[PDB]
Structures are given as C-alpha cells and as structure tokens.
Amino acid sequence: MTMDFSDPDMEFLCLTRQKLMEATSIPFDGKKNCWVPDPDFGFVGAEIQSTKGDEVTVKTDKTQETRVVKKDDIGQRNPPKFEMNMDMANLTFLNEASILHNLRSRYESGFIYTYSGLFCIAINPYRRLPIYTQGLVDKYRGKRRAEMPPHLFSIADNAYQYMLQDRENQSMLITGESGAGKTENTKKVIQYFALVAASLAEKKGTLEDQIVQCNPVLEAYGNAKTTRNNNSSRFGKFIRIHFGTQGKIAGADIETYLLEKSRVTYQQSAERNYHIFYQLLSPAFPENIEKILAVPDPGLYGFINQGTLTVDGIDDEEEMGLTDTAFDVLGFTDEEKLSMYKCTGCILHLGEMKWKQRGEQAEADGTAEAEKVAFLLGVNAGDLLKCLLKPKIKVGTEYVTQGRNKDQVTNSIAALAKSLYDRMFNWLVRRVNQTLDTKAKRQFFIGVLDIAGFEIFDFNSFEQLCINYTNERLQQFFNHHMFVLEQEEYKKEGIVWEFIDFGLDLQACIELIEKPMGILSILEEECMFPKASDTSFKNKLYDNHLGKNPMFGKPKPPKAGCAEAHFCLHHYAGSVSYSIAGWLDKNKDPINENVVELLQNSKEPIVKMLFTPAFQTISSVHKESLNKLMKNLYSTHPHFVRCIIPNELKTPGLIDAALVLHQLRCNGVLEGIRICRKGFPNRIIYSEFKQRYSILAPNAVPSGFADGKVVTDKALSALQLDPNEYRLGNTKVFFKAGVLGMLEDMRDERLSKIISMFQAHIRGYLMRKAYKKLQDQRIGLTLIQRNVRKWLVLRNWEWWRLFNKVKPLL
C-alpha cells in the first residue's frame, strides 16, 4: 500500500500488487475458520469440523490434525482483507493469536518493521538489509506515515516533521529486551537526521559527522559481549539533537545511565569485558601497547580473561582503528587520547598485582606490577602501596593507621578499578558533550532513547530494580501520553467519552521506590552507618513497608538454587523478587579515600577524574538523572519504537512464538489492544468507508455527489447495527470490535448474491430470447401436427382420392 508497490527497494517493505492480492484472496468462513492454541507456535489456523458442547473438533490449517480444544481456546480470525495488515491497530479482531500472526507472517516475508497504533514494532532481522540505503531515505522523506510502508525512517521523519510544524520537542523511545536491536535502530534514527538535517557551512569531524562517531567511542567502552548479544549496550543513552528553526542541526548533548560497574573486574563464563581492552591489546597499534605498558595478549590479564577473548563477529583489530578514528573525528588530542588509553591499561595492571599477608598485614610481592600501575596514574609506587596496605582513616577525633589483610587489600584493588572506569566513562561522555556543544541558537530537540525494558529474571538483585524502576516510569509516561492523545482525538471528532490516566496505575510501585522513606530512601540511610548490615537493610525495609504497601511483599523461592529472596516489588511488567544481596556494597562506591587523596596529584585525567567538583550512592545519582530525563520527556512529542528479539539462536527469519508472544505481553503491545477494546479501537475515515460498504445498501445517486458521512450512516441504519457499536464523528466513524469483521462478512456474502443476480438476469435474457423462437415453432408444429393428422384420415377416403385426380381435370 505504498509508492511504486514494485520498486526494487520495497522488496522488504511492501509486497507487490500481485503478492498482496494473493494473501487477501485466500478462502474463509467466519463460522469455520479460526485461531487455536498450540505447543510450538502458540497458535495456529483452523477449520472447525465438529461441535458437541465444548468438544469442538478442529482440523488445523498446515498439519492436517484434529485436536479437540475446548471452546474458549478457539480464537476468532481476521478476514483476508487484513492479511499482511500494515498497522496492527486496524485488526477488527484483536487477540494474541492475531497479533502474533500479523507479525511473523509479515516477519517471514522480510518485513521487520511494523506498526500497531502509536507503537512501531521492530524485530531483529539478524542480517544486513537494504532497508537503510540513502535513496530509500528520500523516498521516505516528507511523507505522512500512511503514504509509505511501515519503516523506522517514517517514524524518524514524521517526528522531524512535527518538530517543524508544531514548533514543539520530539522524543523517540526505543525499547525491548536484550539483543532485540534498539542500539541498531538508534544509530539509524540518528544517522537519518544527520543526512536529512545536515547544514550548509584538521582531523576533525563536522557537527553531524561528530554526532555519529559517538557510538564507536562510547561502545568501545559501553558495550561488551553477552550471552544474548555480542554487542550489548551495557548502559542507557538519551542523546538529544538541537535544531535551529531553519530546522538544521545546532548540536546535540548526551546522557548515559547505569554503567555496569561490575564487569570491570568480573566476567561470566561465556561473556566478556568492555570491547575496549580487547581492542587495545590488538595488533592495530604497536607503540600503544608499549605506552600503556602492556603485552599483546588479552589472556594474561586477570581483569579480562574469565570468559571469552573474541566474539563470533568481531575484528578487534579493526574496531580499534575505527575507535581510534571516532576519536580524531570527535577532535581529541593525541595526548588526550593517550591519556584515555593509559587509564584503560592501568585497569589491566591492577588485576595483576599479587598480595601475600603476614598477620592481617598484606604486602605486595611483585612491586613490579604496582610500579606500572603507578606510572600510569602518575603518582608514586611506595606512596600508592601504603595508602593501600595501611590506611589513615579518621575515627572522628583522630586519623589512625590501620592494617589491611589480603582479602581486604584485594577487594580494595577492585573498587579502585571499578571506580577509575566509571570516572573514565563519565569523563569520556563529558568530553564529547563538550564538542557537540557548538553554541548556535537552539529552538528545539528530538531526543532518542536506548534503554533496557524491564529486566525481570530468575535471580534479582539491585542493578535489576534500578532498571525496572526506570521503565516503571517510562511505562506511565506512555500511559500518560496515551490518555492525552486519545482524549484529544475523541474531541477532534466530537465523540462524547470518558477516560482515565492509567499512569496513576503505576503510581504505587514508583512511590514506594523513591518516596521519602521507601526502598531507595532507606537504602541511603543504611548505606551511611558503617555498622551497616544487609540483614540491617531488610529490617528497616521490612519494617517500614512490610504488609503495609501492597506493592511490597514476601518473595517467592527457587528450590535450593539461585538464592534467598526478600521483598517482592510487584510491577508493571509483572512482579519481581529482589535480593538484599549486598546492595549497600553495590550502591555506595568504596575506595581508600587515602588513595583518592594521593591521586588528586599526578598526571591530568587522573586529576579531573578524582578531583571532585558524599553522595555517590549509585542510586542518588540515578534518581537525580532519572528526573532530568522525565522533565525532558514530558516536554516532548513521544514516539515509540518497540524492538523485539525473534529467537535465541542469532538467526534470520525464525519465530520462537513462546519468546515473542512473551515480549508482546510486557511491552505494552497487548495492553493498548486490551485498553483500546473497551473503546472504539476501529476508526474509519468516511471516504474509505464509502468506497467499501456502500454495496451493502446502495442507490442511484452518482458517487461524486454523495456525502460520505451520509452513506455510512444510511449503510449502518439499514443493516440494523446497534448504536452502541459505533460513534459517527466529524471525520471517522468509530467502531467497537466485530464491526469491520461482520461488515466484511456481510459484504462478501453480498457481492456473491449480487453477481448471482446478474447471472440471473443473464439466464433471463437468454431464456427470454428463445421463448420467442419456441413460440413460433409451436405454431409451425401444431400446423404440421394438425394437417398431417387430418390427412391420415383422408388418404383412404374413396371420395377423396377421386376428387384428387379428377382435379387436374380442368
């Protein structure tokens, strides 16, 4: 249904006028054809054979089987007009059976992108597609969403459009589980505007060239191989692009969230560390290994080798060279660059210092390690080790020295590694935001968002709740946006109707988490009394909230596995069971303030890095930044790209119905549909409606003189339809569910009878014509048939035969 249905380019967007005439033409019986439940694709098509109470006996579509599902697992199916439906919201029959169907059908044809009302679905192709060529851009430029086929570029664009026409802000929200490719679309969306909008005005970029190189440099540090995705986004991102009236790009600013601090020093069996250590120890830059004082072999480094050392699809030698380029383009000094490596390296050497103790007194062994570690941070060895092994805390009235045992002196060297990265990440973000700030007038912005959706797992700790709380918001910002827009729309058509902002719904979960004395709040207290115990932390929590705020409860168990849970924070997605598992340690950054203070002296980045300018609770900072986002997001037109992972095995065309149908139920896709339904989810534009159901009731009045709204109204009244089922507006007629279903039905069942009638006027023309002939031929015959009989009675009459020869006798 969109511009040159036979464009080579549309090979993955739409079908052909031919191919779609096919899906749409396959048989159907709204009494026989349906949707049923199944073990391997969740649902499958069916033709009802028999019925006996509940024992409905169905023969499926493909298989040829005959199960006997009870009645209720017999889903209603959409008629052929809808096969390949481009926007999920126009389905007369709303159900998972369908939503799933509309989806893989489209998916197994090469169609990843696909709309459903306000949301635009994506499903990881897992394979280069041509969908994103420049020429496609143009084709997609300027157009309202329905003039073209479903595609990121429209959503990217209409966003851009509305930015201009409405002189207001634009936010694009990409979601979905892990490895469902939201970082993939993001840089598309971003790469889009970089062309559409680019301006007209040594080793350095261009404001647009630069907006783009953010990824390399960020990802060489933010991403790392994970079981679900080899290029996992280990963090949240909100980038924002500012446009100057004229509508060109004025600069952008970046926001990052929840850096997984833990892989710095820890890596699961299969997994890996931030792609950058691997890119450094790469053959790509020889001297560089020298400068960060290291040796070409990601194997020797305790902080790197605990899992992999390579990813199925990555050429770490290239990446680096690429990464080293995003630097130059972003305009960083050779020196600034070195500085960002040596730090990366110190994280190597850290994990290579070995300790030994002689009574709670650990001791270096190979000063050799720390010596390097020392040369990177620009401080000094002995002074470093000291702060490390023996520290002078400050017990209120005094500064005491103390003894640190190997476990301690070790655990300590971790934090310092996990702290020096975080710092380094931030400085790196901080340093880009610095180049993406041209300072040129800024009317508005479109801001993109890559971020996990709710992370609900089998074992749930802190880092879990963080993210879950995050989308806990984002979920109501949506529920909000909807409420508004849905109410506005029913005004534009003037259809009386009452609603309710469901964001209110998510308000408990969210308060308890952030309110003055709920979870995170209490977590700040505990986090503050050295004499702090995790057991301590659940006493305060349990106490305050226990059976006193519903959204807080007793955690469910595993078997003798996973581990001990404590309070179940019922959410949006579902409900999670959380682990007190040492959030206090997790939350607050530790670190020999002794070392801290010794660092505040040295070599620069070190300086900026530890040179502050009490609240590092990974949480305080998150609630801080989380807001800075919601203010931004409620100041924008929200736009939703809902990413989806097709299946585990990283494979092209393949639907783990089970998995997919899972996401559909914690995305919000099945919620809009659930909500719309107790509304008029079917909204038809008067013209369109005339062109299709007039046949049900028609007349003599030429079409160009008839008025749409009038037709529709005549067409329904005649049919007897309940007024309950529709609302006729100023521009659309609003229908409940089954309406477009029945209409379609009553229709084909009409067109049929109509053509029979023609063929009945034809069987009447023709029969009438010979009626002429058999009217004549009956005269001929009764003639024959009455003379030939008269004759039989004379050929033997003596008088007669006489008269006969005596006749010529004249």
Next chain:
Amino acid sequence: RVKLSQRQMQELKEAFTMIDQDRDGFIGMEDLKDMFSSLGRVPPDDELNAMLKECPGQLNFTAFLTLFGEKVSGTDPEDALRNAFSMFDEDGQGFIPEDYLKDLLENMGDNFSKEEIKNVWKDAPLKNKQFNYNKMVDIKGKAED
C-alpha cells in the same frame, strides 16, 4: 381453418360437374361408373351403393359439399403449411431428419401415438434417412411419387 372456403368449394363445384356431364340430372352411379372409366380403373357395385349413401337423401351439390366439409376442417392454406416444416429444418435444403421429426411428432406437441406415427411412414417421403417436407405437403392434397 374449418367449416367453409371459397376456391375449395368452387372446386368441389366444378368437381361435382364432371360427374353429371355424364348427365345434368346428377346422373350418379351411372356416371360414378362412367367418371372412373375415363381415369384408369374398374369399381365393384356395393361401393357405388355405399359410397353414395354415406350421404342420406341425395348428393345434390349443397349436400355434396356436406360430406366434403366434415372432412376438410383444417386443410390450412399451402405456404402456411410449407413454412411450418421450414421452422424445424433451418438447414436450407428441403428436409427434416427421420430421427428429429420422429421425437417431434411423437413426443412433443399434441403427441402422436404409435399407430399414427406408423401409418405416417407407410406412405411417407422418407428415402435415404432424411425427409422431403415439400411433399407430404405436396401429398397434402396431391401431386406425386
């Protein structure tokens, strides 16, 4: 159709005239005998005296017309009859097929019975398996072999 006709009557008129020239007295058998004599064959008695009494009193002319009428009530004009046959042939030549004509007079219309469909062949112009319609027509009144 039925009970009268101009030429037809006059022909029975002149017809009734070649019979009494064998005497203006309506000189009957004497000339029934004598009118068959100029034709080509010899007739028994009993017929001469039964042929005549198929009529009661006397075969005067008016009456000569009555024995003839009760026998010609449908002898519909010629072309009205030559065309009938034309309707079920529209082949062009002058014929209706045996096979056809047979369903025709026997199944359709005021259905012909076996006894009549039979007689219908004894004298019938059916040579080679077709049927010259312009003859049972010619054999309407009469003409040839």
Next chain:
Amino acid sequence: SQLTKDEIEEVREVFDLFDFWDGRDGDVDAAKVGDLLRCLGMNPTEAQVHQHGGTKKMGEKAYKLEEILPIYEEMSSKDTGTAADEFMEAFKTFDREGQGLISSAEIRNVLKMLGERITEDQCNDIFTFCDIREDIDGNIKYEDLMKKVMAGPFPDKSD
C-alpha cells in the same frame, strides 16, 4: 391466490407453451420452473428456484397450473430482484482504476468462476447478443453490458 385474472391469464399463456413441448397434457416438469419464470419476465437465481419449487433434474416431478400460480405469486413478491445500482456497485469492486473499463478475461472469469456460475456458452452467447466489444487494450465497459443485459433481447418493439 391473491393474483389477478390478468396475471393468471399471463401465466397460462406461458405454461401451455411449456406443456406443449413436454407434450400437451397439462403438467410441466419441475426443472422447468426456473425457465418458466424467466419467461413470465422474472430473473430468479437458481437458489431462489430450488427453494421455491424448482428441482434439479428432469424426472423429479411435474407441476400443474394451479400449482405454479402460488410458485409465481410467492416470487413476484421478493424485491431484492437486483438493481442497476447494485450491479454497478459490484463491478467497481473489479474496476481496477476508475475509468469504467474492465479487462475482458476478468469479466469472463467473474461470470464463469464466481457466484451462481455460467457455462462458457451462456457466457459467450450473451456477450454476443449484446455486441459487447473489447477495445484496443481489450477491456469492457461494464455499463454497456449492464444496460443491454437488463434491456432485454427485444428492446424497442421487434428485435
């Protein structure tokens, strides 16, 4: 029943014609019902006939006259008889563009494949007794066909 003296008169006028060919005897074969109506001017569909008295095979049973009257009556009553409006609405559903034209095959398939299907005969006969021509691009004006089809075969007074 509630019919008139004229109509009744009008029904015989045709019945007897029908009787005359199965051999005058005053009974007509049920498969005839269909055609016997098309000549009393109507245009039932087979479905309409079946349900109404029609049968689908020639030795099934014959009706008398006082037996067709009601079959006639009850049927001169349905009024979805089909209007010039409905046909024309239906063909748009095949009018690819809007120019009123329609691929020659396609019309020949609708008529042959869908609804109450028609023989490659009736299908070609009628395109002939209605002179429905293609045009360079080989398409047909569905309105030209509809007007004629519903005109009759004998329009002005003769043929």
